[PDB]
Design an enzyme around this catalytic site. Structure first.
Site, PDB file in Angstrom:
ATOM      1  N   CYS A  50      -0.404   3.602   6.710  1.00  0.00           N
ATOM      2  CA  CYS A  50      -0.511   2.210   7.111  1.00  0.00           C
ATOM      3  C   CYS A  50      -0.633   1.367   5.862  1.00  0.00           C
ATOM      4  CB  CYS A  50      -1.716   1.970   8.007  1.00  0.00           C
ATOM      5  SG  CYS A  50      -3.305   2.174   7.197  1.00  0.00           S
ATOM      6  N   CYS A  68       0.788  -1.217   0.000  1.00  0.00           N
ATOM      7  CA  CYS A  68       0.000   0.000   0.000  1.00  0.00           C
ATOM      8  C   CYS A  68       0.821   1.268   0.000  1.00  0.00           C
ATOM      9  CB  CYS A  68      -0.938   0.008   1.210  1.00  0.00           C
ATOM     10  SG  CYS A  68      -2.101   1.369   1.318  1.00  0.00           S
TER      11      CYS A  68
END
Lengths: 711, 420, 420
Positions: C404, C90
């Protein structure tokens, strides 16, 4: 001796090489065969050498076709058929030798080179864009240099190359394997111990010699799914193929090309009759259609075609790399569609976003069809597309060095537009504009720099047609003009330079043709008939399609522009009614449907303007429009439109719409004669006395003292 | 001279198998786990000290992206160790070590694991560009998406062609081979060498950078398979496959589809002397350059080497042990032939002469590529220990490793001997 | 204090479109080219000075591997510029910038391009594990390979489930959401904010990190699409999809499948002042840590931030402007709730108290994720300019960006204001 051709011994193999240091390219000539004769007989008088190979050691093309000033070298009929009967006797020498031979192709082999190529047992080609393989035979209108058309369909087939040898168009080396002319391919090389192209011409020698020893002891054989269905099958469908082609050639073109059907009768008689006896029919044919009035001036068209693909202004100084296209639409995105692929950075100005969608969807849609026909790779497509950025306001014109206006024509708004897009541009630039009507010397006195402004006028579908035109003021420097024509020929579209005038050249000659396009329906002769009537004389698109070509909105302006000066007396000469056409609001091509439309008739029957009577048949009005068109086309250079008018209709036939197989409007003093056209308008002498009045320079040398322009 | 140094420690390599043998059962993050556990078998390092492991693939098996994360979690690492993959064409691993040494010399972390893992056995054959629009399927809209259909089912293939020029590895291979005057006989002396040394290398059995592991589906163990010697007369009969028989690259003297993995450990020198492991090598400068993929496609290493020699400040002939990576026979002798002459450093940079002169004696003696196969993204992280244990074995102290990649990138870096 | 500094220059971002609109026609290296040409449109840099471009994907469209190489060659770059991709889950981009700043501070190169490019419109649906064994097919052996067959045709799906725990993003999302006492009403105040600010941000029109380009298949232009405001009563009716209706994550306050790209330029400061471009920011320290994917799956940023504050040597409350990345509503307020109390820094490290206290005022004002969508591997290389132009716009001089990732990795780095 060995002036252009030579060999040596390596591998006990005769490496005959082709070169000609005088010209840039090598041409088939009598001056080449005069030594090409007495070499292969010595090859045939040898025994140690058991295989031979010919190649063009000069970089570039393989050979030319017929040498342009040798078939056009004027000689009488028996000698022009004697040379064209001798020219294949030397081919029937070598095509069936005991000692087999191999040719090779690393260039644009064209014309008689296939005569050298496919007469061989085995040829070999280089897969790149520069090597193309085409037959310029019908494009100059003849039959080829040694009549290879009697062994092309023996080799590849009647229906396979029948759409090749008279379509004119060339093929790259990639499809030639699937076609079957050349069988093996070899891609070129990059870096070498020698410079990166001289090895590739010296690489083929060794691939040839490693094919060559195998041919002598027969380890490989020269016996190399639609044609296989045809391959034995023609007992009865015979008429039912060339009849389909017989009406094909007259549905594609019209029947007034006596050139290309005269190669059909070859392949019509080559089948089913004496094949070796068929090699002398074209000896009774090549002398005919070269010594005729169809393509006699077509050689001069080709001389001008090659003659204006030249820089012609000194040396290019400080070449351009960036562009600046002021205005989207149909010209701007249009000329971006051609000026983007071969290495020109472009920036496309627009006003709002609402027209860039109509912008890039030209430069993309007219691009990926190019990769849909496999002419480019799928990747380089998109780098070509990404060379074109589209700005919105101004950020980036400080890097620009050449500017082209593209806004819809007006004298008032562009007068300001040049004044606000002058400040954010450097001084070593070029301003230019694609005006169609109003001249540049009226707007060349406004800007800060007077001398760095030229004009470049394009033509309307920019991809298909293939020329530019230059507009040159008093103040254009030689460096400005050379830098302009550098963009012109690096563009690829054949240039002509024009010293200006009120109405420069092309609309200057088009409006005195367009002003009588109303004159046929001024009486009401059902102008749907006029399309056939004028395409019968040779124009590829009808005059109705010409007024549906120009756009109906600019027609009133190109009526008023020279009618402001002298268009009322001889840049015209009929009552204008196009403002009545647009009074309802007809939209032209953007309205989709052209002209029955049920409303042109109310114009003429508004008030009874046609009680007119004169003996004017179809041939009469054809020659009326053509003779006025050439009256204007001979009016030019009487004021000195340029230096020498033999440069003229290289422009005026090649985008204007004038028919080839008619030599040009500057070329009807020669095969049709100024005497005969002056008898035509002297037959027309008592009609009006005002508009059709002939010019003075052509008329004094016209009839009696056998004078021509330059011939 | 005040930059912190950096150290290669013992370089585990699981052995390379030609595809079709026991790695046709595996799963493309599993022998990653095997090579990494083998690294943790001979290093005795606490599993919480290893800081930042980085791997590199080329295929990217998309059921599990970022291979290194779960491939470190699978071998029972402490999971306070971030990871990422680095994908290039061919020098993926040996781009791993250079971003690791950049990570160390920044002065924020402790130790690096660098490895390269792939399997060309299961190439990804994906479904189509437009059938995957039936992802819109996942009660009448379920019908109307299925309403438009003709026969356009065709699995498009990952044809390894570099995409910038739309042609395979072998066309550019024999182009560059034939362009620098390489005969068929001269091109296969090297093919004879690159097996004749390899069988002797496995015979003495000191190529000891190999862990075994068991393939879970098939029987016992593994050991390298691509080694076969032959004679020169039994090679020229092999008809070439990449081009029509006039060309000069055949499958005998060419790389083959093989699978395998590799890993190592890269330590800062001060913690290498604080903990007390005996190192192998330093890891000095690295140039990293690319070539335009129209002309010099596989002219990888020898446009990069004189840019790293002047970077380190030394000379060519006084290196002690090369090893250049290969991908084709002849390519490496074209990377001998071109720079043992002028005209090529000329006109592609300015004013050098003969800056490549490898004397061929200090070359690939422990057989490099073509010996034990060429994994597509794991070579290099063989090659560093094959430089290190090699130049420890004889004398000498320096040596460059250089490799070529599918796409024009080169790689070249010098490796120094053990600090004792 | 003698380490060379490093500089962000103007950060082009092509706008983010929800999947199903005009990016359902594209090709997953093309808007890479669009974003990169847009970077070369507003930077005026000579195209031969740009040194070492690096991108980052997550999908890796395997017809063309190592996206950055041909994606730089497509935009007409000089091809003496090596490239590689970097694939994480990500924070792929915003792993690009940190390996770039490591590449610069090593002191060997000049300038970096870092970007993140993906399209979740065409996910790779690959064929099967065992039908691809028919690659052995490519005259009786061609039959005998085809002889063994039953009906085992099934396209296996790239179910985004992180594979270490075999469950999707949303299960771990609402687990961590419910575990830190988040009501449904408190979880959607933030959902109201993250659109209410976004529409005003596009209304004033100073979020000017956006180039347009034209999609070649569909009509005109692009501009961001994921922005819609609503009321709180018109949100609680949306029945949650990730779990049975007792849970608390629905598709309204959750990320959506969107596509897009981003790029920037990273310069050494001394050549930034030698050439003369006006910079935007420095790029100081970066901690980079992971979390064990059984418990703290999406506790990404707030285990990493007090490890970077002590790394830089400053304090929490005297930062000037955060922006934390989101992937779910509530997650970010659980990353508010947990560290505004004890017991969690306790027992997961030793002896701190309340080292996360973000005062919520200096938070995501120019709406972060959930505002204009969350591309799966391109966020972050939005976020740095959304820190930079933001903290230039008001006062202040420092600010941390933290994100995150799917798999336990966090990211956190501080960004300083303009050097004038």
């Amino acid at each position: 001796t060995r002036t252009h051709i030579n060999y040596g011994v390596k591998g006990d193999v005769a490496v005959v090489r082709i070169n000609s240091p005088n010209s840039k390219v090598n041409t088939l000539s009598k001056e080449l065969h005069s030594e090409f004769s007495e070499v292969m007989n010595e090859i045939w008088a040898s025994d140690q050498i058991r295989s031979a190979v010919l190649i063009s050691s000069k970089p570039g093309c393989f050979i030319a076709g017929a040498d342009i000033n040798m078939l056009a070298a004027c000689k009488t009929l028996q000698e022009v058929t004697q040379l064209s009967q001798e020219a294949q006797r030397i081919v029937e020498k070598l095509e069936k030798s005991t000692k087999p031979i191999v040719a090779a192709i690393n260039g644009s082999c064209l014309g008689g080179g296939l005569e050298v190529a496919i007469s061989c047992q085995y040829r070999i080609a280089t897969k790149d864009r520069k090597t193309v393989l085409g037959t310029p035979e019908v494009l100059l209108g003849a039959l080829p240099g040694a009549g290879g058309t009697q062994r092309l369909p023996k080799m590849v087939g009647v229906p396979a190359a029948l759409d090749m040898m008279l379509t004119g168009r060339s093929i790259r080396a990639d499809r030639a394997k699937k076609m079957g002319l050349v069988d093996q391919l070899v891609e070129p090389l990059g870096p070498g111990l020698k410079p990166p192209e001289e090895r590739t011409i010296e690489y083929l020698e060794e691939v040839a010699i490693t094919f060559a020893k195998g041919l002598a002891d027969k380890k490989i054989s020269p016996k190399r799914e639609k044609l296989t269905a045809y391959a034995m099958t023609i007992p009865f469908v015979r008429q039912q193929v060339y009849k389909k082609v017989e009406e094909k050639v007259r549905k594609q073109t019209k029947g007034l090309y006596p050139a290309p059907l005269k190669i059909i009768d070859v392949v019509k008689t080559g089948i089913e009759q004496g094949s070796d006896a068929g090699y002398l029919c074209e000896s009774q044919k090549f002398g005919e259609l070269v010594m005729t009035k169809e393509s006699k001036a077509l050689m001069g068209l080709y001389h001008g075609q090659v003659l204006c693909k030249k820089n012609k202004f000194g040396a290019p100084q400080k070449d351009v790399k960036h562009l600046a296209i002021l205005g989207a639409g149909l010209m701007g995105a249009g000329i971006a569609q051609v000026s983007v692929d071969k290495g020109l950075k472009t920036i496309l100005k627009d006003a709002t976003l609402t027209a860039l969608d109509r912008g890039q969807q030209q430069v993309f849609k007219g691009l990926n069809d190019k990769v849909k026909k496999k002419a480019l790779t799928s990747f380089e497509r998109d780098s070509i597309f990404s060379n074109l950025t589209g700005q919105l306001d101004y950020q980036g014109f400080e890097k620009a060095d050449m500017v082209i206006e593209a806004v819809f024509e007006d004298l008032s708004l562009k007068h300001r537009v040049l004044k606000e897009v002058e400040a954010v541009i450097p001084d070593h630039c070029i301003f230019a504009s694609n005006t169609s009507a109003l001249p540049i010397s009226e707007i060349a006195a406004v800007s800060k720099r007077p001398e760095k402004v030229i004009g470049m006028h394009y033509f309307s579908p920019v991809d298909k047609m293939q020329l530019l035109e230059i507009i040159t003021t008093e103040k254009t420097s030689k460096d400005t003009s050379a830098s302009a024509v550098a963009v012109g020929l690096k563009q690829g579209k054949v240039i002509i330079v024009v010293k200006d005038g009120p109405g420069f050249y092309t609309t200057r000659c088009l409006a005195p043709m367009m002003s009588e396009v109303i004159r046929i329906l001024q009486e009401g002769v059902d102008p749907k008939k006029l399309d056939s009537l004028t395409t019968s004389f040779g124009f590829p698109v009808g005059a109705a399609t010409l007024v549906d070509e120009v756009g109906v909105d600019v027609a009133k302006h190109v009526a008023e522009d020279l009618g402001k000066v002298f268009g009322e007396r001889f840049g015209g000469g009929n009552p204008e009614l196009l403002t009545q056409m647009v009074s309802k609001g007809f939209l032209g091509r953007k309205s989709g449907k052209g002209f029955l439309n049920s409303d042109m008739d109310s114009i003429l029957a508004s008030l009874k303007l046609p009680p007119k009577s004169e003996v004017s048949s179809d041939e009469d009005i054809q020659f009326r429009l053509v003779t006025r068109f050439v009256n204007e086309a001979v009016m030019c250079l009487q004021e000195g439109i340029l230096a020498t008018p033999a440069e003229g209709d290289i422009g005026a036939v090649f985008g204007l719409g004038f028919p080839p197989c008619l030599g040009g409007p500057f070329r009807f003093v020669d095969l049709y004669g100024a005497q005969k056209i002056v008898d035509r308008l002297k037959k027309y002498e008592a009609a009006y006395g005002k508009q059709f009045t002939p010019c003075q320079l052509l008329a004094d040398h016209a009839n009696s003292p056998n004078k021509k322009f330059y011939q | 001279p005040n930059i912190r140094n950096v150290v290669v420690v013992d370089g585990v390599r699981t052995p390379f198998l030609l595809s079709g043998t026991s790695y046709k059962d595996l799963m493309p993050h599993d022998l990653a786990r095997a090579a990494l556990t083998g690294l943790l078998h001979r290093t005795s390092v606490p599993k919480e000290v290893v800081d930042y492991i980085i791997f590199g693939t080329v295929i990217q098996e998309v059921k599990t992206s970022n291979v290194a994360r779960e491939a470190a979690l699978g071998a029972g690492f402490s999971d306070k160790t971030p990871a990422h993959t680095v994908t290039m064409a061919c020098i993926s691993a040996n781009q791993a070590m250079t971003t690791g040494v950049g990570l160390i010399a920044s002065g924020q972390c402790d130790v690096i694991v660098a490895g390269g893992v792939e399997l060309m056995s299961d190439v990804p054959i994906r479904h189509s560009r437009k059938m995957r629009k039936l992802m819109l399927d996942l009660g009448q809209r379920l019908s109307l998406i299925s309403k438009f259909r003709f026969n356009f089912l065709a699995p498009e293939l990952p044809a390894v062609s570099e995409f910038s020029t739309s042609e395979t590895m072998g066309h550019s291979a024999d182009r560059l081979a034939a362009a620098f005057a390489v005969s068929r006989l001269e091109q296969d002396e090297y093919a004879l060498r690159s097996h004749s040394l390899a069988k002797k290398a496995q015979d003495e059995g000191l190529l000891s950078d190999v862990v075994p592991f068991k393939v879970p589906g098939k029987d016992t163990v593994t050991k390298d398979n691509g080694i076969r010697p032959s004679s020169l007369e039994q090679m020229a009969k092999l008809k070439p496959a990449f081009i029509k028989p006039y060309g000069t690259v055949t499958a005998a003297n060419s790389s083959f589809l093989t699978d395998g993995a590799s890993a190592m450990l890269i330590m800062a020198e001060e913690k290498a002397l604080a903990m007390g492991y005996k190192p192998k090598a330093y890891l000095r400068d690295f140039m990293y350059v690319s070539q335009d993929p129209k002309d010099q496609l596989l002219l990888g290493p020898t446009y990069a080497t004189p840019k790293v020699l002047e970077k380190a400040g030394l000379t060519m002939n006084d290196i002690d042990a090369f090893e250049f990576h290969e991908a084709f026979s002849g390519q490496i002798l074209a990377n001998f032939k071109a720079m043992d002459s002028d005209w090529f450093a000329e006109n592609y940079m300015g004013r050098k002469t003969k800056v490549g002169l490898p004397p061929l004696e200090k070359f690939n003696n422990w057989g490099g590529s073509l010996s034990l196969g060429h994994p597509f993204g794991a070579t290099g992280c063989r090659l560093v220990m094959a430089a290190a244990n090699r130049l420890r074995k004889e004398g000498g102290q320096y040596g460059l490793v250089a490799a070529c990649a599918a796409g024009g990138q080169g790689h070249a870096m010098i490796v120094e001997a053990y600090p004792k």
